[PDB]
Design an enzyme around this catalytic site. Structure first.
Site, mmCIF file in Angstrom:
data_model
loop_
_atom_site.group_PDB
_atom_site.id
_atom_site.type_symbol
_atom_site.label_atom_id
_atom_site.label_comp_id
_atom_site.label_asym_id
_atom_site.label_seq_id
_atom_site.Cartn_x
_atom_site.Cartn_y
_atom_site.Cartn_z
ATOM 1 N N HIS A 1 2.454 -10.787 -0.550
ATOM 2 C CA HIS A 1 2.963 -9.472 -0.925
ATOM 3 C C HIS A 1 4.451 -9.242 -0.695
ATOM 4 O O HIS A 1 5.068 -8.424 -1.378
ATOM 5 C CB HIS A 1 2.169 -8.380 -0.214
ATOM 6 C CG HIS A 1 2.307 -7.032 -0.847
ATOM 7 N ND1 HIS A 1 2.104 -6.821 -2.192
ATOM 8 C CD2 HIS A 1 2.615 -5.825 -0.321
ATOM 9 C CE1 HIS A 1 2.284 -5.543 -2.470
ATOM 10 N NE2 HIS A 1 2.595 -4.917 -1.351
ATOM 11 N N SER B 1 5.106 -2.946 -4.673
ATOM 12 C CA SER B 1 3.904 -2.460 -4.014
ATOM 13 C C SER B 1 3.469 -1.115 -4.594
ATOM 14 O O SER B 1 3.236 -1.003 -5.800
ATOM 15 C CB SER B 1 4.167 -2.330 -2.525
ATOM 16 O OG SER B 1 2.951 -2.403 -1.814
ATOM 17 N N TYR B 2 3.360 -0.081 -3.768
ATOM 18 C CA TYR B 2 2.947 1.192 -4.335
ATOM 19 C C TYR B 2 3.956 1.634 -5.396
ATOM 20 O O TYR B 2 3.613 2.361 -6.324
ATOM 21 C CB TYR B 2 2.792 2.263 -3.248
ATOM 22 C CG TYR B 2 1.987 3.469 -3.714
ATOM 23 C CD1 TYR B 2 2.516 4.377 -4.623
ATOM 24 C CD2 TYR B 2 0.684 3.667 -3.277
ATOM 25 C CE1 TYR B 2 1.773 5.441 -5.081
ATOM 26 C CE2 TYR B 2 -0.071 4.732 -3.732
ATOM 27 C CZ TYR B 2 0.476 5.616 -4.631
ATOM 28 O OH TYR B 2 -0.264 6.691 -5.065
ATOM 29 N N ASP C 1 -0.750 -13.429 -2.689
ATOM 30 C CA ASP C 1 -0.762 -12.074 -2.138
ATOM 31 C C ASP C 1 -2.155 -11.747 -1.602
ATOM 32 O O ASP C 1 -3.105 -11.588 -2.370
ATOM 33 C CB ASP C 1 -0.385 -11.048 -3.221
ATOM 34 C CG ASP C 1 -0.006 -9.681 -2.641
ATOM 35 O OD1 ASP C 1 -0.657 -9.224 -1.676
ATOM 36 O OD2 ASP C 1 0.937 -9.051 -3.163
ATOM 37 N N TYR D 1 8.879 4.156 -4.890
ATOM 38 C CA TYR D 1 7.816 3.758 -3.983
ATOM 39 C C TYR D 1 6.757 4.854 -4.104
ATOM 40 O O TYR D 1 5.612 4.579 -4.460
ATOM 41 C CB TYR D 1 8.299 3.672 -2.552
ATOM 42 C CG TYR D 1 7.159 3.317 -1.646
ATOM 43 C CD1 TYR D 1 6.417 4.305 -1.016
ATOM 44 C CD2 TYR D 1 6.775 1.992 -1.477
ATOM 45 C CE1 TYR D 1 5.324 3.989 -0.245
ATOM 46 C CE2 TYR D 1 5.682 1.661 -0.705
ATOM 47 C CZ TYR D 1 4.954 2.666 -0.089
ATOM 48 O OH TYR D 1 3.846 2.348 0.664
HETATM 49 C C1 LIG Z 1 1.621 1.205 2.674
HETATM 50 C C2 LIG Z 1 0.686 0.344 3.403
HETATM 51 C C3 LIG Z 1 0.106 1.289 4.680
HETATM 52 C C4 LIG Z 1 -0.450 -0.159 2.581
HETATM 53 N N1 LIG Z 1 -1.392 -0.836 3.516
HETATM 54 C C5 LIG Z 1 -0.151 -0.996 1.419
HETATM 55 O O1 LIG Z 1 -0.032 -2.355 1.668
HETATM 56 N N2 LIG Z 1 0.026 -0.527 0.041
HETATM 57 C C6 LIG Z 1 0.295 -1.553 -0.979
HETATM 58 C C7 LIG Z 1 0.362 -0.703 -2.264
HETATM 59 C C8 LIG Z 1 -0.971 0.146 -2.074
HETATM 60 C C9 LIG Z 1 -1.134 0.212 -0.485
#
Ligand SMILES: CC(C)[C@H](N)C(=O)N1CCCC1
Ligand SMILES: *[C@@H]1O[C@H](CO)[C@@H](O[C@@H]2O[C@H](CO)[C@@H](O[C@@H]3O[C@H](CO)[C@@H](O)[C@H](O)[C@@H]3O)[C@H](O)[C@H]2NC(C)=O)[C@H](O)[C@H]1NC(C)=O
Ligand SMILES: *[C@@H]1O[C@H](CO)[C@@H](O[C@@H]2O[C@H](CO)[C@@H](O[C@@H]3O[C@H](CO)[C@@H](O)[C@H](O)[C@@H]3O)[C@H](O)[C@H]2NC(C)=O)[C@H](O)[C@H]1NC(C)=O
Ligand SMILES: *[C@@H]1O[C@H](CO)[C@@H](O[C@H]2O[C@H](CO)[C@@H](O[C@H]3O[C@H](CO)[C@@H](O)[C@H](O)[C@@H]3O)[C@H](O)[C@H]2NC(C)=O)[C@H](O)[C@H]1NC(C)=O
Ligand SMILES: *[C@@H]1O[C@H](CO[C@@H]2O[C@@H](C)[C@@H](O)[C@@H](O)[C@@H]2O)[C@@H](O[C@H]2O[C@H](CO)[C@@H](O)[C@H](O)[C@H]2NC(C)=O)[C@H](O)[C@H]1NC(C)=O
Ligand SMILES: *[C@H]1O[C@H](CO[C@@H]2O[C@@H](C)[C@@H](O)[C@@H](O)[C@@H]2O)[C@@H](O[C@@H]2O[C@H](CO)[C@@H](O)[C@H](O)[C@H]2NC(C)=O)[C@H](O)[C@H]1NC(C)=O
Ligand SMILES: *[C@@H]1O[C@H](CO)[C@@H](O[C@@H]2O[C@H](CO)[C@@H](O)[C@H](O)[C@H]2NC(C)=O)[C@H](O)[C@H]1NC(C)=O
Ligand SMILES: *[C@@H]1O[C@H](CO)[C@@H](O[C@@H]2O[C@H](CO)[C@@H](O)[C@H](O)[C@H]2NC(C)=O)[C@H](O)[C@H]1NC(C)=O
Ligand SMILES: *[C@@H]1O[C@H](CO)[C@@H](O[C@@H]2O[C@H](CO)[C@@H](O)[C@H](O)[C@H]2NC(C)=O)[C@H](O)[C@H]1NC(C)=O
Ligand SMILES: *[C@H]1O[C@H](CO)[C@@H](O[C@@H]2O[C@H](CO)[C@@H](O)[C@H](O)[C@H]2NC(C)=O)[C@H](O)[C@H]1NC(C)=O
Ligand SMILES: *[C@H]1O[C@H](CO)[C@@H](O[C@H]2O[C@H](CO)[C@@H](O)[C@H](O)[C@H]2NC(C)=O)[C@H](O)[C@H]1NC(C)=O
Ligand SMILES: *[C@@H]1O[C@H](CO[C@@H]2O[C@@H](C)[C@@H](O)[C@@H](O)[C@@H]2O)[C@@H](O)[C@H](O)[C@H]1NC(C)=O
Ligand SMILES: *[C@@H]1O[C@H](CO)[C@@H](O)[C@H](O)[C@H]1NC(C)=O
Ligand SMILES: *[C@@H]1O[C@H](CO)[C@@H](O)[C@H](O)[C@H]1NC(C)=O
Ligand SMILES: *[C@@H]1O[C@H](CO)[C@@H](O)[C@H](O)[C@H]1NC(C)=O
Ligand SMILES: CC(C)[C@H](N)C(=O)N1CCCC1
Ligand SMILES: [Hg+2]
Ligand SMILES: [Hg+2]
Ligand SMILES: [Hg+2]
Ligand SMILES: [Hg+2]
Lengths: 726, 728
Positions: free
Chosen positions: B702, B592-593, B670, B509
């Site tokens: 998402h 995600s990240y 998404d 992550y």
């Molecule tokens: C972690 C969250 C606070 C953030 N809004 C998010 O959806 N992330 C998705 C991946 C880049 C940012």
């Protein structure tokens, strides 16, 4: 021995088929756009002269991708800033080079963003569309006459077709037709005010921060279609003060009762024009023959002079009613129509006789009428050897229908069994184009005595080159299904041994009126699979197939996704039980309508196929455009054919995908078969818990033809197939 | 003999974790939803008593997804026809049930498609949002009063947030705040007129003929941000005027000078509200404290009462400015802020005194403030044992900060090292929620002496099952790189054997302020990959990870896509040195990240990973929203940080993707990390002729949390992982 035809070879196009594209500029000479410059040839002797050097435009400042010389020989339309659109359409910038003064025209030049440009048939007149409105230039440098003022983006189209007329009815982008000597300019107008819009995302280059949404009027099955109008304007009678006066030709009344389409427009003479119309229910069409009334200024289409063409077993024409071919005086004509028995042959008409006379007959079909002279009628048919996958040039004596001569049959029966032709202005000469089973062969002839003048391109180079690689062979043949015989072809691996067992890949299309079994010579993916991967690639034409009469073709009328898919299963089933086919390794794949069939087969539950790939397939007919779909399917209403529309979707078979390895591929920018189709398939499999392989191609359309995408999709597919087979 | 934890077990949720969700209605009782019968409990003894019985809402025809009783207990809001929107927002239909007469109110019902509803914190007043406008009801059956008229779809939002404010600033959908008394109603109003719209196709059910184009005002990096205004209205005047005027509270001038955000709004007293603001350049934040002027009818915010909070190494707060907690009289408050050492601690503020006093220690951090009484201040932190992945409840004596007591550390040190807590209205009682490393344990306590009253849930049921299956183990240790330790996590296969080499999957992550290594007990995909496939699933919190001080968290400031990525790779190397890892079978995946980090690593060219999966990754920061992105990357302009915005895309490393097996997954609906991002990643790999696996999920957002989709994605990823490791 030697090496094989590899995937790289195919993707990198290392083995190029040579061509010979000529454009007749008279009945004695043709133009041959070489590579650097352009040449003009004398058909009689073969000698030539350069029409204009390549460098003539070095410091033009742009890259030119098309030179269109006026029938005069005095001007050259230069095409640049080529931005493709749909199948035929595109936008571009234009410039005209005056050959008399050897200078580029610099005043009143054609607007950037022009949609279409066309010269008059004889002079140096110009009709072009810009912002959906028609403009006429009587002289290449003089001001332009605004022929129309109702043009409005995505709403009203003057002189050009809307998405669906382009793809489905005209099969061309242009919606304007000059009279033979350029006096009149006929044109059509499309109103898409209520035609629903298809919207999808286009991502463009990485640099674009926000994706943009493409939206185009596209009527889906049962939706609201664009309405159309037809007008004729006199281009010798326009001022500059007064706007042009276009006379409208309407009806027929039998058509105006409900929705309809303008199918074809052909000029019989300088003052006679024929228009074919067809009801939304492509079951009944009418041809109108209108005449210009000198001292009245209107166009009259006398009833009784019209001709009705209908079908009780299916739809009119193979994909649309046939093109009429008028005699010199425009009092009679020839067109291909369906037999009483359902076979397509040439019928002879009398503009005022309600009945015509077939001049050809038998159980085979006339592919197309290529040239008409007071003397003969030149045409192409698959009559030779009774094999529908073969094409030959024929000429029938208009005085004695008994005197029919085959012009291409005997030239080289070994190498040539499939021809196309290009006649000169008056049919004094004609270029024959052979494309199989051997390497393409281009030849030039004179019609007076069918003298074989000379070889234009024999691909001798490619031949010598190909003899150095283990190339695969191709077998055309047929099998019998309770009475009827259906053809099939098989690309066989080098040194094919009927004793060994080979995995088999069923290459399918099978759309209504299609042919995947012929004598054409091709260098494609199938070539590699057989040459390098020793895989048998077979194609089979079953019910719905074409060029074999309406009994076969119309078999799937109002019932798409039944017999054509079933016959495909039956065929593969017979192929396996053949001895050289490893039944544990039979796969299937198709693109477009072939993606649909492939998907339906994989979800049939036959258990015959181990794996399959579907590229840009149709998933449910209500998602495809009206014109093509309703033709075979009728309307998606409960009173008509809604039940079958719902019973023939791919997703309804999701559950059966559990026993097969499926690869779903589709471009995100497909304006033809919307990504929607594959997205509903994937979602249906997910709902049923069936795992599969996927691959999308961002910003690609129905052809997924971008250079990089092409090599990438074929590379991915190869892995998938050999993984399934090894 | 004894089966393992299978993919089907995970997908079918065979082994379920029991929970004990409370809802304190007072300082002594709480409601417990028993799915058919919602009963009220007495914290003191453990009483029961049905509050709303089994068959009380039948013949309703509609299924109630959630309830909500009014503070004074006289009414109950029935929520039905639930229709999710974003992470928190959703639409639904509502009906109010009168308890004072067991009747269901049918007069002046709340409109259908109501975007949001809330009771006043006292009594039975109502405030809901419909068609982007705010409405107020004094009596549930009486006609409501409209308080806003500027509501306009995708343009002007009143009482609710726009997309970015919901996800990146408030982390809540609601944008209105009743005063504690219920006299005033404060709300924010967002104007998204100039905010670009993200547009994508939504296919819907198969029966839809034409796809739909969802378009949401969504500001990508550097784009035009929505603007905001704050208003306060007096609801007690509604029945006397006709159109109660909404008083607006503006500024601060230091905020008005440029783009900014309204961060937090909390009521201090009956007529004192505090408003926190932040510049678009999130390095400068300001809190205003405004008092009602019973003479001017306006709200003034004395400047001697304003507090500035600015950061020099990064942004302000973890994901936003810290939340304030006022004392009864609203004359002083507590906030969590990083001290000079870079550690987040609680410091005491006097409303009209610029400098605060830190009341908590050193090398660890306070996660959040939980409760405040005249006596103590309760908080959660990772002080215990000195492990940041741990979590405990502490209370500090207000009269002497040297008196700090850990209320949870010792309750069951072997099974419980991660707690969360839920106090009662006056902190008379509080429920402790233990999350690991053992099975979830819920207990009730009284604050007088902090004694356990009883066990509300021990998961003994689940415990009995899991012993009959070969469960995997969890090693929670750390490593030291550059004389500073970074913690890692490893989910080891049953009967782990340090002699035999094991295949390894790096679960990542690694986003700004995150924690992948902890003590929480989990039953996820990893439990399967370890239990059955015998794969070690590890995680690593490197630079950028939180709860360990700004030295570590701010390391990746304006440098997103760097250290976070390189550390993740080093960890794999470090894990290889440990000796029980198969060098030729090391995979990496993330969502995600984590998808982003995973891709960047795959495109690094450091032949450490064989394959990798990226679910809904970020490809280039110019594609993500402004609030989140700019907070770490600044503005994507040549003057500011443009150069790195471009140097950190996934596509710029497409070429290197030839030496690894990649699987790109992403949902088409998404609304957060737009499909566009993966669309550009596929397009770039294609341009450079690199083959890869792909999978899109029609209409999934998402989360890709659709029941069927969820099973499908994990089934699809499992094949890819075992194929890559050559199992099965
Ligand atoms: C972690 C969250 C606070 C953030 N809004 C998010 O959806 N992330 C998705 C991946 C880049 C940012
Ligand atoms: C939300 O913000 C938008 C701007 O982002 C506000 O709209 C702007 O409002 C002003 C004044 O109301 C408009 O100016 C006026 O324009 C008209 C027409 O040209 C002119 O006749 C007037 O003299 C005046 O100049 C401006 O055009 C408009 N901008 C846009 C893009 O709409 C809007 O008022 C805000 N809404 C709320 C509730 O705050
Ligand atoms: C309750 O009070 C509010 C605010 O006092 C009222 O809203 C205001 O209403 C006016 C007119 O409806 C809005 O527009 C104005 O219109 C004139 C007319 O041409 C125009 O020239 C002005 O430029 C202006 O745009 C005004 O913006 C609006 N203000 C707010 C904050 O919403 C509301 O109508 C009242 N409700 C009732 C039921 O009376
Ligand atoms: C292109 O085709 C249009 C219709 O297909 C022509 O127009 C006609 O259609 C509109 C609606 O599509 C009619 O009605 C308008 O006004 C009513 C009033 O309420 C609305 O209900 C409706 O939605 C429309 O806004 C028009 O009355 C009708 N004809 C005319 C003359 O207005 C349009 O004229 C045509 N364009 C060309 C150049 O042929
Ligand atoms: C090709 O050459 C043509 C002349 O060639 C000679 O004459 C032929 C009749 C024949 O015997 C051939 O073997 C000889 O070499 C030439 O033909 C005519 O056409 C041009 C106009 O296009 C005319 O100006 C010229 O006078 C004519 N020549 C004759 C003798 O009839 C033709 O032009 C040329 N074509 C091209 C495209 O080069
Ligand atoms: C079609 O457009 C080209 C390019 O100019 C366009 O129009 C300008 C007003 C400006 O918006 C440009 O960005 C557009 O691309 C015309 O070609 C000329 O090209 C020269 C050299 O670049 C340029 O200096 C001129 O501005 C351009 N046009 C003019 C009027 O000066 C071209 O003339 C246009 N075609 C027609 C028939 O109008
Ligand atoms: C040619 O016909 C068109 C019809 O639209 C005329 O063009 C419009 O004329 C009206 C005046 O009634 C203007 O308001 C419009 O702006 C004009 N443009 C368009 C596209 O509608 C035009 O005036 C006619 N020309 C002559 C010489 O009569
Ligand atoms: C092209 O055909 C048109 C139509 O037949 C010819 O124009 C007519 O010419 C006659 C005399 O020859 C006139 O009486 C008519 O008024 C014309 N018709 C119209 C509608 O204008 C024209 O002559 C032909 N062009 C050439 C070069 O022969
Ligand atoms: C062309 O097809 C239409 C139907 O698509 C035929 O007309 C009738 O249509 C209705 C409604 O779909 C059906 O219930 C009838 O069975 C159809 N036929 C009859 C006799 O009513 C029409 O007959 C077809 N035209 C031709 C010449 O076959
Ligand atoms: C609680 O709400 C307000 C918060 O101050 C209390 O104060 C009254 O506020 C109104 C303005 O709405 C003033 O006009 C009164 O003068 C205030 N009261 C006093 C005693 O000064 C209000 O009294 C409280 N309401 C309830 C229901 O408890
Ligand atoms: C917060 O960071 C910003 C960056 O946006 C700094 O703002 C700018 O102005 C400073 C002068 O005070 C410069 O030293 C910075 O380099 C400059 N930053 C950029 C990217 O332009 C600001 O100084 C910072 N504020 C604090 C309190 O540290
Ligand atoms: C719970 O029961 C209360 C009375 O309980 C009895 O008296 C107290 C003092 C203890 O001795 C206890 O053990 C006895 O059972 C009621 O007053 C209260 O209303 C009840 N609450 C609920 C929710 O049922
Ligand atoms: C005859 O052949 C057709 C075409 O394959 C097939 O559909 C049918 O089952 C066979 N028998 C009959 C009675 O149609
Ligand atoms: C909400 O919708 C239902 C049925 O769709 C209707 O009975 C009810 O009256 C509606 N509520 C309001 C306030 O209109
Ligand atoms: C040393 O610095 C960091 C710790 O600050 C460490 O994670 C990293 O591995 C080392 N440097 C580099 C270039 O990686
Ligand atoms: C084949 C062509 C005439 C046709 N328009 C078409 O694009 N097909 C795509 C698959 C369904 C129809
Ligand atoms: Hg047609
Ligand atoms: Hg055909
Ligand atoms: Hg904020
Ligand atoms: Hg955090």
């Amino acid at each position: 021995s030697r090496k094989t035809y590899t995937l790289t070879d195919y993707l990198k196009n290392t083995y190029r088929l040579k061509l010979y594209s000529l454009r007749w500029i008279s009945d004695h000479e043709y133009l041959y756009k070489q590579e650097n410059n352009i040449l003009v040839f004398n058909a009689e002797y073969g000698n030539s002269s350069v029409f204009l050097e390549n460098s003539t435009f070095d410091e033009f400042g742009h890259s030119i991708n098309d030179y269109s010389i006026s029938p005069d020989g005095q001007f050259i339309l230069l095409e640049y800033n080529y931005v493709k659109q749909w199948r035929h359409s595109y936008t571009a910038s234009y410039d005209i080079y005056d050959l008399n003064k050897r200078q580029l025209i610099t005043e009143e030049r054609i607007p950037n963003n022009t949609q279409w440009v066309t010269w008059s048939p004889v002079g140096h007149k110009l009709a072009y569309v810009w912002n959906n409105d028609i403009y006429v230039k009587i002289e290449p440098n003089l001001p332009s006459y605004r022929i129309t003022w109702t043009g409005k983006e995505d709403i009203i189209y003057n002189g050009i077709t809307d998405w669906v007329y382009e793809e489905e009815v005209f099969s061309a982008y242009s919606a304007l037709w000059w009279s033979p000597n350029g006096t009149f300019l006929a044109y059509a107008q499309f109103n898409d005010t209520e035609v629903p819009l298809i919207e999808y995302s286009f991502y463009s280059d990485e640099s674009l921060q926000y994706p943009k949404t493409v939206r185009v009027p596209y009527p889906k099955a049962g939706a609201v279609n664009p309405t159309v109008k037809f007008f004729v304007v006199n281009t010798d009678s326009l001022s500059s003060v007064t706007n042009a006066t276009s006379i409208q030709i309407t009806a027929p009344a039998s058509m105006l009762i409900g929705d309809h389409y303008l199918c074809d427009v052909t000029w019989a003479t300088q003052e006679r024009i024929s228009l074919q119309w067809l009801r939304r229910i492509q079951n009944y069409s009418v041809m109108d023959i209108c005449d210009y009334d000198e001292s009245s200024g209107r166009w009259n289409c006398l009833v009784a002079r019209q001709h009705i063409e209908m079908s009780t077993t299916g739809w009119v024409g193979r994909f649309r009613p046939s093109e009429p071919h008028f005699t010199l005086d425009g009092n009679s004509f020839y067109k291909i129509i369906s037999n009483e028995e359902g076979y397509r042959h040439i019928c002879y008409f009398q503009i005022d006789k309600k009945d015509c006379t077939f001049i050809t007959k038998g159980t085979w079909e006339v592919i197309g009428i290529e040239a008409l002279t007071s003397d003969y009628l030149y045409y192409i048919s698959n009559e030779y050897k009774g094999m529908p996958g073969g094409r030959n040039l024929y000429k029938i004596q208009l005085s004695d229908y008994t005197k029919v001569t085959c012009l291409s049959c005997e030239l080289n029966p070994e190498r040539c069994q499939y021809y196309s032709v290009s006649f000169s202005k008056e049919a004094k000469y004609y270029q024959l184009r052979c494309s199989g089973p051997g390497l393409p062969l281009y030849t030039l002839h004179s019609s007076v005595n069918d003298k074989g003048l000379r070889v234009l391109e024999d691909n001798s180079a490619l031949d010598k080159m190909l003899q150095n690689v283990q190339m695969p062979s191709k077998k055309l043949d047929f099998i019998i299904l309770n009475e009827t015989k259906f053809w099939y072809q098989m690309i066989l691996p080098p040194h094919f041994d009927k004793s060994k067992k080979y995995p088999l890949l069923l290459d399918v299309y099978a759309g209504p009126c299609s042919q995947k079994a012929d004598t054409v010579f091709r260098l494609n993916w199938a070539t590699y699979l057989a040459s390098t991967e020793n895989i048998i690639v077979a194609s089979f034409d079953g019910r719905g197939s074409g060029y074999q009469g309406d009994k076969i073709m119309h078999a799937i009328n109002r019932r798409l996704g039944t017999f054509e898919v079933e016959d495909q299963i039956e065929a593969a089933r017979q192929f396996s039980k053949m001895g050289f086919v490893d039944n544990k390794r039979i796969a299937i794949w198709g693109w477009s309508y072939g993606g649909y069939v492939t998907s339906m087969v994989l979800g049939s539950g036959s258990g015959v196929f181990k794996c399959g790939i579907a590229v840009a397939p149709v998933s449910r007919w209500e998602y495809y455009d009206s014109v093509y779909t309703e033709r075979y399917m009728g309307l998606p209403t409960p009173e008509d054919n809604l039940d079958h529309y719902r019973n023939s979707t791919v997703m309804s078979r999701a559950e059966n995908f559990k026993q097969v390895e499926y690869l779903l591929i589709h471009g995100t920018a497909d304006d033809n078969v919307h990504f929607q189709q594959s997205a509903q398939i994937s979602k249906a499999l997910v709902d049923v818990g069936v795992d599969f392989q996927a691959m999308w191609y961002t910003d690609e359309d129905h052809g997924i033809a971008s250079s990089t995408a092409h090599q990438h999709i074929y590379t991915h597919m190869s892995h998938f197939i050999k993984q399934c087979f090894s």
